[PDB]
């Protein structure tokens, strides 16, 4: 109930929301249907429109008018945005030459440059180029300020997950807004774009920027906007807030546009109807910049122009129906569209079988335009699993397609030609970033980055300490003229042991064999040198990784590779090795096929054993440093050490053997040498963070040897490929992956073919950032380089996406 007979007089667009049953006058009272009776009359005036004309100059103030052209209007803060242009001889902001903003140029009383975030729904990255002729204000922000070619959204590439990511720096699995619609099994309630349930704060986690600001004494404008408030009024409202007294005036503001998304869904991303929405957005930007320039704030405020996601061509006829695959389709609930999420129709039904659902949806049609996944098997780069609102079964839908449960859902639940929501590496889903103002760089292009990183930057722009988030603070320092954050490397927590030869062969009873007894002062000093770390500068090019948790581990040196060997997990945490452009691939000799050798540096008690692998009829083993890339027949014996062995399903061995035998050499050919760091990952609770030893759910049968969930590699070279990886003087280039360690290749529909037709496609799908591997391993990489730490932070956030230009 609302006692809506109170009044908005003197309260229009008030900043503090009042509590029931008193009626409201803020910019959300319309959503809530709780505005005072006189809200429209007082606060949503429209008379005479939004523009001054010559005949209104110096008019007598009429309070009925939408905005004002009277002489008192600047002092009151309510002139039309074009007032100075029409009535005072001034130029539109867009018509001025851009001039470097070296320092904030702010009126007296401004304690810090305000931040205005201008968010545009469905603004696809390529609109910057393709729409350039009709967006002059946006094109000026872009060319004069700091811009990226594109900005990567989060998955799913939907509105609410992405805007709330922008506000929090968190993945949707962490903030809780995991879709535009979601069912929470604990609440037993559904959230939707439309309706009242989304008003409840229980859905919204983390700490958004407006709260971070308020907790630290920095006042913040509303970031939500009622849809019925027109854009012109949103802008005049922000400009009026900016005229408040010092002690009342917000430092951060947000404008939101429902365009071009609204039109894009109807007309497709490049429909001829899309030109006008782009023009109207640009006009809005120009109203804002003209307004700022009138208030002498155009060289004082920092503006961010950002989108939430792009837009793809999607029509009713490109719909896959689950009813074509499943017999039991009335037993499921599907969240449909550009992603699929499946759960049982009837909660707590014990017979619903997710495995039978997955099997019925796997590789069933040659052209199939989705792939089903248990959420723990989704590519780790999507960080889309650790929330009870994410259903166990997920369908990743091909771009340009939809999934639906049954045909009636689509012809009675084509009105649309555009949609979004697909995998966040898809080109059509990429969006925009421009930063303009004193604190941003001038005329500067920056590489593409992820929207999770902006919260840290916005905090920096406001002098705030960010709440804990998924950004990497320092990775976007290169956007800013003046940084208030100085990143430093985390401290190493565990120092390694450097064991020498401590055990005789006969002390081991590991059930291993090797044919290695075919045995010189020359090449015995040399091999001792190698075991002591003489080639280490070649194979460990960026320092050893730091271990950032408490554990017991050994550094093991070899001719061809170095490793950090865990005495807790009985396998390396990391194995580092350089392969030059000139390196040769060799086979595993017939006599060494099943060779495994005790490592005399490492106790029997901290070793794996071959018997466990013999007894475990599901589990085999592989090697982290590949015997195929041994520098010499003699060095190759080091690759069969028990300390280089890891547990591998036979199905996974096909992927790993192809990577090691064929792909590493190819990358060394293409990149002029590569440095590879490989290792295991344990993430049995799918939270994206390294498991403790007591979280491990699977061991090699009858042993304490833990089975990894994933295997990683980080593959580094010189960005200037005219220099060899091992003699690089400048910036680096990296690609990485996190492959799921699965006992079948059901993910790869072509897996029955030669690995040359499917393995590399799989690895591309599971591309990763170094930062992702860092979270999953508790390791910190690139500790010793000649590069700045900020530059190395950007390197660690890079993702190789494999999309075309
Ligand atoms: C990306 O970034 C984020 C942010 O850094 C990372 O997410 C963090 O990861 C941490 C480790 O997993 C996790 O720590 C938890 O926190 C538990 C407390 O959780 C509640 O309180 C949080 C703080 O709120 C306040 O924040 C500031 C201070 O920073 C205050 O000033 C304000 O007043 C704030 O209110 C809060 O953020 C958190 O929110 C989640 O839960 C809500 C759902 O109920 C949602 O609204 C919200 O969206 C969050 O939901 C996400 O996170 C939860 C996990 O918290 C997850 O389950 C959801 O799916 C979703 O993902 C809560 O409101 C704390 O109790 C935990 O401590 C237990 O474990 C540790 C481990 O050692 C023990 O030492 C400890 O003693 C304790 O064990 C005991 O209790 C156990 C029961 O859990 C029991 O089993 C055991 O036997 C013991 O009795 C732990 O520290 C952070 O909560 C989490 N933050 C967020 C926002 O998600 C993330 O990892 C990053 N991702 C990657 C890939 O890097
Ligand atoms: C957490 C919190 O404080 N509350 C209280 C406010 N409540 C709320 C109330 C009214 C709303 N009315 C509308 C129209 N809309 C649509 C809208 O504004 N879209 C633009 C937009 C901008 C910024 C963000 Cl971050 C996001 Cl996700 C969306 C909302 O989302 C909305 C939300 C949500 C929970
Ligand atoms: Ca984990
Ligand atoms: Cl959704
Ligand atoms: K076996
Ligand atoms: Zn949309």
Swiss-Prot record:
Glycans are attached at residues 3, 348, 360, 470, 750. Pfam families: Endonuclease_NS (PF01223), Phosphodiest (PF01663), Somatomedin_B (PF01033). Belongs to the nucleotide pyrophosphatase/phosphodiesterase family. Zn(2+) 1 binds at residues 121, 159, 308-309. The active site is at residue 159. Keywords: Calcium, Chemotaxis, Cleavage on pair of basic residues, Disulfide bond, Glycoprotein, Hydrolase, Lipid degradation, Lipid metabolism, Metal-binding, Obesity, Repeat, Secreted, Signal, Zinc. 1-hexadecanoyl-sn-glycero-3-phosphate binds at residues 159, 180, 261, 420. N-glycosylation, but not furin-cleavage, plays a critical role on secretion and on lysoPLD activity. Its EC number is 3.1.4.39, 3.1.4.4. Abundantly expressed in cerebrum and cerebellum. Localized in secretory epithelial cells in the brain and the eye including choroid plexus epithelial cells, ciliary epithelial cells, iris pigment epithelial cells, and retinal pigment cells. It comes from Rattus norvegicus. GO terms for molecular function: alkylglycerophosphoethanolamine phosphodiesterase activity; calcium ion binding; lysophospholipase activity; nucleic acid binding; phosphodiesterase I activity; phospholipase D activity; polysaccharide binding; scavenger receptor activity. A motif (Cell attachment site) lies at residues 76-78. It catalyses: a 1-O-alkyl-sn-glycero-3-phosphoethanolamine + H2O = a 1-O-alkyl-sn-glycero-3-phosphate + ethanolamine + H(+); a 1-acyl-sn-glycero-3-phosphoethanolamine + H2O = a 1-acyl-sn-glycero-3-phosphate + ethanolamine + H(+); 1-(9Z-octadecenoyl)-sn-glycero-3-phosphoethanolamine + H2O = 1-(9Z-octadecenoyl)-sn-glycero-3-phosphate + ethanolamine + H(+); a 1-O-alkyl-sn-glycero-3-phosphocholine + H2O = a 1-O-alkyl-sn-glycero-3-phosphate + choline + H(+). Its main location: secreted. This is Autotaxin. The gene is Enpp2. The record marks 796 as: Essential for catalytic activity. Residues 541-805 are annotated as: Nuclease-like domain.
